[PDB]
Amino acid sequence: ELDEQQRKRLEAFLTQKQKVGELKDDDFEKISELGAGVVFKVSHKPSGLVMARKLIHLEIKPAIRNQIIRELQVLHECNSPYIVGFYGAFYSDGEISICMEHMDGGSLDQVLKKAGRIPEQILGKVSIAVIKGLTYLREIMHRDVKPSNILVNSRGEIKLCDFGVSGQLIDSMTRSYMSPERLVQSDIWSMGLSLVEMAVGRYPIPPPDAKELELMFPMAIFELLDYIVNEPPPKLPSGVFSLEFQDFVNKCLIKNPAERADLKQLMVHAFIKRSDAEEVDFAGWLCSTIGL
Ligand SMILES: CCNC(=O)C#Cc1ccc2c(c1)NC(=O)/C2=C(\Nc1ccc(CN(C)C)cc1)c1ccccc1
Ligand SMILES: [Ca+2]
Ligand SMILES: [Ca+2]
Ligand SMILES: [Ca+2]
């Protein structure tokens, strides 16, 4: 479902997008550098709009990059309040561009790094969008839900950015959020692994013993991937998070993908019903958290 706010914004996005024409390299002025995704906050000179320009260095033939572009045209169709807006994609001087909606809060990975750890009420709302994002995508499949893959903003929006719509792009160019069975329900797992990472403020594999957990409130890359498979999943610490929340992530982080909760089930899980109901000023927290 969409509100008459979420609908109005999508009309305001499209109309401001219909004004923007065919994207060319020369029509962009660099404002600043956002970070490695390398993404620039740009200004589309003729339209006067502000965008996020991802630039991928790729040594490939014409017939290759022309495919990549054709596959990214599919992102014009895919419009949702839980998916980051798309303006276009092209190739120029030895690099493919992807011109997209500028989310002035940056990634949850960034917000975590400055927040410390994210509050439950807040992670309530993050969970709701990430589900509706995945539920929109379903109603093509997704590629890996990280906190670096979730963008947020001062309006109070929470959107999935960078799912995989182009195969050859993935080809031509971490694995620590993958579900064991990948070594559809993998998406839910990652949301479970992520929410925990943000709730406690640290990557939860391996788990912190009572030494850190008491105070709060390294493994080599391939050594980890084993532990993920052969040992039990991470869980929120008890006593500091509500049990409704503890159950949610538990039902997400089940190793056996069948016994793991699906999208339809999570969407009506007590945690969601509680949060959706809650009246939380997300845009306050964020803006005050990261100083805007
Ligand atoms: C082809 C399919 N689509 C994609 O591949 C894509 C994408 C994409 C990727 C990143 C961004 C985006 C879109 N829009 C944005 O605003 C992004 C970022 N904004 C952003 C960062 C920091 C501050 C402020 N900081 C510095 C405090 C503000 C804003 C961002 C950039 C680098 C790393 C993390 C996030
Ligand atoms: Ca250029
Ligand atoms: Ca140029
Ligand atoms: Ca020129």
Side-chain angles (χ1 to χ4, degrees):
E1 188 175 342
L2 302 186
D3 314 324
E4 289 182 311
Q5 184 169 33
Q6 292 177 320
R7 184 173 180 180
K8 188 173 179 180
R9 288 169 176 172
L10 289 165
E11 190 173 19
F13 179 75
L14 281 167
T15 315
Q16 290 178 6
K17 173 172 178 179
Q18 282 175 14
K19 292 177 181 180
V20 174
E22 194 184 55
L23 312 195
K24 293 174 181 180
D25 168 54
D26 299 351
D27 295 342
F28 292 113
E29 176 185 304
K30 179 179 167 176
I31 314 177
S32 55
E33 192 171 6
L34 304 182
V38 183
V39 175
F40 297 105
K41 182 190 182 174
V42 299
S43 177
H44 181 246
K45 282 146 61 173
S47 72
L49 276 69
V50 191
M51 300 172 205
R53 186 194 194 176
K54 182 173 276 184
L55 297 171
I56 304 179
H57 202 110
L58 283 163
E59 289 283 306
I60 47 169
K61 293 185 177 180
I64 295 175
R65 61 219 171 191
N66 296 358
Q67 184 158 48
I68 294 177
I69 296 304
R70 199 184 328 103
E71 296 171 333
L72 287 170
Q73 300 314 315
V74 184
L75 295 169
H76 292 315
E77 302 175 332
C78 312
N79 296 324
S80 197
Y82 319 102
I83 302 292
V84 172
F86 186 91
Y87 293 108
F90 57 87
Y91 173 79
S92 70
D93 186 33
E95 56 198 346
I96 296 174
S97 306
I98 292 181
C99 300
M100 300 217 78
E101 189 190 12
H102 163 80
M103 295 294 277
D104 67 343
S107 69
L108 280 186
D109 173 48
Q110 281 183 328
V111 180
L112 178 67
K113 210 173 284 179
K114 202 133 200 163
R117 55 161 171 285
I118 300 181
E120 195 187 308
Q121 284 212 332
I122 292 290
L123 296 174
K125 297 309 197 178
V126 173
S127 305
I128 292 177
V130 172
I131 283 184
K132 291 174 179 192
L134 292 163
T135 308
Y136 170 79
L137 290 174
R138 175 166 149 278
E139 296 181 350
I140 307 187
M141 296 182 180
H142 187 272
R143 322 283 170 166
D144 202 300
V145 175
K146 318 181 178 189
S148 76
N149 215 63
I150 299 179
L151 301 178
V152 289
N153 77 355
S154 42
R155 268 175 153 188
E157 304 184 303
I158 299 182
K159 312 188 173 194
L160 294 172
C161 74
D162 190 344
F163 68 96
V165 73
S166 176
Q168 270 285 17
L169 188 63
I170 292 176
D171 298 359
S172 303
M173 293 155 61
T174 192
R175 204 164 275 263
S176 66
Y177 291 91
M178 290 209 175
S179 50
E181 73 273 358
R182 284 182 65 178
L183 325 181
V184 179
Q185 290 288 97
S186 176
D187 293 311
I188 299 188
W189 166 275
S190 307
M191 168 158 53
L193 189 47
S194 289
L195 286 172
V196 178
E197 170 164 19
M198 285 175 304
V200 313
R202 153 189 186 281
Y203 185 70
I205 313 167
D209 287 35
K211 288 176 160 290
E212 305 89 26
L213 288 168
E214 184 183 1
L215 293 168
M216 283 162 64
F217 301 84
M219 291 200 83
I221 181 56
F222 59 91
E223 296 187 359
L224 179 67
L225 284 156
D226 288 339
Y227 185 98
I228 289 169
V229 187
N230 304 328
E231 294 295 329
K235 53 145 193 190
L236 289 157
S238 60
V240 304
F241 295 96
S242 68
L243 297 155
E244 277 154 313
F245 184 45
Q246 299 191 64
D247 194 58
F248 178 76
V249 292
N250 277 11
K251 290 199 162 63
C252 305
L253 283 155
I254 301 201
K255 307 221 286 182
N256 183 353
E259 297 167 31
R260 186 186 308 160
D262 68 39
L263 269 171
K264 189 180 185 179
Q265 294 189 333
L266 285 187
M267 191 62 206
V268 297
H269 182 281
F271 180 51
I272 300 323
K273 282 192 278 227
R274 202 191 71 203
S275 295
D276 207 358
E278 286 169 333
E279 282 272 30
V280 169
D281 194 314
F282 185 95
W285 177 85
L286 175 64
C287 291
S288 299
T289 279
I290 75 185
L292 296 172

